[PDB]
């Protein structure tokens, strides 16, 4: 109970509180689970004054509680106050993970064997997420946790949405995110109607980054982002322009100077040819032509790991997304109180 600043009262069960690396929800500590007798990871949350911090906290919890997969971080426990009135913070306990792809890419050159195995786990976890009818929407290196034995786990589902046809709102681009380098081009061109393919695009960016230790599209803003993308893929074909339904976005693209495609083998001369063929299918401008998670796993680059007899899917896909925008924070704090109930005495 002592981390730079405030009350991190994770009760008697958790002690030996060390300080870890920032996630997105706030202060994160490591600790000893005196019940399961193992070190864990603990995240402190306090989002009740903000409608959106509440939305993200509730999404993350509703989804992670219902997912169970080797390549997806789980929630081991949730610590919160006895009554909805005393509840101001929320501690989410999860498996302690040694590092993440973001840290690793800053210090290590990944052999093709590492790249192959990391990419396979990312997709195996994604296959499960998508089989549940969920879009992660914010895949990036720091959201890919790893242990010392290279076991990988996807985390941070605060921005995830159920692919609910009957409703999907505008304003995702306007959300605060630590980085937009992994966002698919349709996110900057159409106002909504995003599909599972935005997650495959993010994975393609991560694969590219594993191949050279540098982000492939590091724009400094939406306009710059799209320019980096078009600078490598080349100007969209008339056929590609057909997937952009927004009038101003389509006019914006036709006002941009023509650009040729830069061959993948020119950007990544030392990369495995099969990895590049797969990269090309993931970083396809047109969302409909982009490779699907299941076809991706079946790609030749991942042949030594593909095994559909050992790649779990959700038994029951979520069919509806939650009306959390038209809901005042008080009703969110409320729902957050109900969802965390299963962990109270």
């Amino acid at each position: 109970e002592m981390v730079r600043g405030q009350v991190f009262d994770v009760g008697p069960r958790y002690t030996n509180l060390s300080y870890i690396g920032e996630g997105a929800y706030g202060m994160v500590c490591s600790a000893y689970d005196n019940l399961n007798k193992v070190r864990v990871a603990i995240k402190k949350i306090s989002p009740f004054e903000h409608q959106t911090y509440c939305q993200r906290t509730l999404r993350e919890i509703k989804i992670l509680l219902r997912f169970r997969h080797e390549n997806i971080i789980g929630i081991n426990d949730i610590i919160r106050a006895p009554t909805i009135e005393q509840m101001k913070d929320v501690y989410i306990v999860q498996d302690l993970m040694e590092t993440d792809l973001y840290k690793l890419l800053k210090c290590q050159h990944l052999s093709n064997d590492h790249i192959c195995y990391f990419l396979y786990q990312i997709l195996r976890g994604l296959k499960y997420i998508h089989s549940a009818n969920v879009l992660h929407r914010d895949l990036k290196p720091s959201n890919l946790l790893l242990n010392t034995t290279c076991d990988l786990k996807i985390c941070d589902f605060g921005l995830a949405r159920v692919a609910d046809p009957d409703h999907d709102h505008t304003g995702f681009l306007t959300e605060y995110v630590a980085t937009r380098w992994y966002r698919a081009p349709e996110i900057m061109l159409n106002s909504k109607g995003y599909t599972k393919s935005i997650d495959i695009w993010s994975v393609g960016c991560i694969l590219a980054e594993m191949l050279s230790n540098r982000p492939i599209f590091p724009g400094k803003h939406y306009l710059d982002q799209l320019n980096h993308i078009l600078g490598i893929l080349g100007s969209p074909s008339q056929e590609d322009l057909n997937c952009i339904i927004n009038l101003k976005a389509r006019n914006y693209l036709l006002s941009l100077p023509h650009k040729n495609k830069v061959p993948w083998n020119r950007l990544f001369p030392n990369a495995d040819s099969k990895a590049l063929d797969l990269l090309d299918k993931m970083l396809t401008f047109n969302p409909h032509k982009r490779i699907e998670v299941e076809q991706a796993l079946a790609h030749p680059y991942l042949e030594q790991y593909y095994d559909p007899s050992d790649e779990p899917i959700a038994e029951a896909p979520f069919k509806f997304d939650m009306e959390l925008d038209d809901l005042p924070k008080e009703k969110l704090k409320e729902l957050i109180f109900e969802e965390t109930a299963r962990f109270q005495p």
């Binding site: 080797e70 390549n71 040694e98 590092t99 840290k103 690793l104 800053k106 210090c107 290590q108 064997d113 590492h114 195995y117 786990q121 195996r124 790893l146 010392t148 034995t149 290279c150 076991d151 030594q304 790991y305 095994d307 050992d310």
Partner: peptide
């Protein structure tokens, strides 16, 4: 380890 399960012996190490 998922990797052993797949029959991969390559000792994949991390430096950080």
């Amino acid at each position: 380890r998922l990797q052993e399960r797949r029959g991969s012996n390559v000792a994949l190490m991390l430096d950080c």
